[PDB]
Design a protein around this ligand. Structure first.
Ligand SMILES: OC[C@H]1O[C@@H](O)[C@H](O)[C@H](O)[C@@H]1O
Length: 288
C-alpha cells in the first residue's frame, strides 16, 4: 500500500481516466507513491462508500477523493479526518455542512469554476443564435451534485439576462448517455422550435447529439457539452456537436495531489473550524 490513496468516480468516463494519469504523473514528479481506485459505474454510491472505508482502514497518509454525490462519502471522509489522514476533495464538492456535523474537514478543494463553465456554454449559444434567439434547454447532471448545479445555475442566469432566449426545460440525466438521449428526445418532441441544448457533461452531450440526429435535426439544434473528452472533441470537429466547455482533469488531479502532499508535510491536519484551501483550474470553450 502506497503513501496516498485516490478515489475517483468511474474510469468508464475519459474525464476520470485523464485525472488518473495526471495524478500518476504528478506522483512521479513529487516522488510519492499513490494507489488510485474508482467505482465501476456512476450509480455506485454504496460501493464507493465501502471502497473509501476499506482504504481509510489501511496505512495511507492521505486520501484525495471525488465523491459520486454531495453526501455519499461524508461519513467515511469524517472518519479519515478524525484518524488524522490528509484529505483533498477533487472536482465534485462534498457537503461541507454535513461533513462538519460528522466532525470532519478537508485540507483543500480543487475544482473548475463550474458557474463560469455553465455561463461560457450558455454565452456561446446566445452568440450563435444571434438577435433571433429562441428556445433552449439544459441537460443537467445528478440532482444535488455541486458540479452540475453550478453549471445549471451559470447557464440559467446567462440565458435569463438575454431577452431573446426562453429556457423551456432544465432536467437531470444523471451523467448518463442513454438517459440524456431519452430526455433530449422528449424535450424535442414537446418543443418543436427548440434551438439549443447546453449539457452539463460530454457523456450526456453525446446522447443529446444522438437524440438530435434521430429527430433529423443535426445543425438545426445546437449541442454544447462539458469536459472535452476525446469523442466529444471529434464530434465538435465533425459538426455532430457544436462545442464543449473543456476541463483539465489532469491538472485538477495533479494540483489536488500536490495540495495533499504539501498539507501532510506540515504534520497536522486542518482544524475542523478552518476554511480549506481552494484552487481553481481553468476551463476553455472548444468550437469548430
Ligand atoms: O462523472 C461525471 C462528471 O462529474 C463532474 O463532477 C466532472 O467535473 C465531469 O463533468 C464528469 O464528467
Amino acid at each position: 500500500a502506497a503513501e496516498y490513496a485516490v478515489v475517483l468516480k468511474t474510469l468508464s468516463n475519459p474525464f476520470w481516466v485523464d485525472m488518473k494519469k495526471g495524478i500518476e504523473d504528478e506522483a512521479k514528479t513529487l516522488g510519492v507513491s499513490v494507489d488510485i481506485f474508482a467505482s465501476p459505474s456512476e450509480g455506485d454510491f454504496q460501493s464507493q462508500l465501502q471502497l473509501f472505508e476499506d482504504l481509510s482502514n489501511k496505512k495511507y497518509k492521505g486520501i484525495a477523493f471525488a465523491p459520486l454525490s454531495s453526501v455519499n462519502l461524508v461519513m467515511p471522509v469524517a472518519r479519515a479526518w478524525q484518524k488524522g489522514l490528509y484529505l483533498v476533495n477533487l472536482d465534485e464538492k462534498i457537503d461541507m455542512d454535513n461533513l462538519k456535523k460528522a466532525g470532519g474537514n478537508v485540507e483543500g478543494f480543487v475544482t473548475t469554476d463550474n458557474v463560469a463553465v455553465g455561463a461560457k456554454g450558455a454565452d456561446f449559444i446566445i452568440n450563435k443564435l444571434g438577435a433571433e434567439g429562441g428556445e433552449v434547454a439544459i441537460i443537467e447532471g445528478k440532482a444535488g451534485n455541486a458540479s452540475g448545479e453550478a453549471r445549471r445555475n451559470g447557464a440559467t442566469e446567462a440565458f435569463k439576462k438575454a431577452n431573446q432566449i426562453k429556457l423551456v426545460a432544465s432536467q437531470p440525466a444523471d451523467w448518463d448517455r442513454i438517459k440524456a438521449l431519452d430526455v433530449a428526445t422528449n424535450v424535442l418532441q414537446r418543443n418543436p422550435n427548440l434551438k439549443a441544448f447546453y449539457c452539463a457533461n460530454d457523456t450526456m452531450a453525446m446522447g443529446v447529439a444522438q437524440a438530435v440526429a434521430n429527430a433529423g435535426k443535426i445543425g438545426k439544434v445546437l449541442v454544447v457539452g462539458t469536459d472535452g473528452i476525446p469523442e466529444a472533441r471529434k464530434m465538435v470537429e465533425a459538426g455532430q456537436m457544436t462545442a464543449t466547455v473543456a476541463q483539465n482533469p489532469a491538472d485538477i488531479g495533479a494540483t489536488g495531489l500536490k495540495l495533499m502532499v504539501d498539507a501532510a508535510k506540515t504534520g497536522k491536519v486542518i482544524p475542523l473550524e478552518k476554511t480549506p484551501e481552494f484552487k481553481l483550474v481553468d476551463s476553455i470553450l472548444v468550437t469548430k
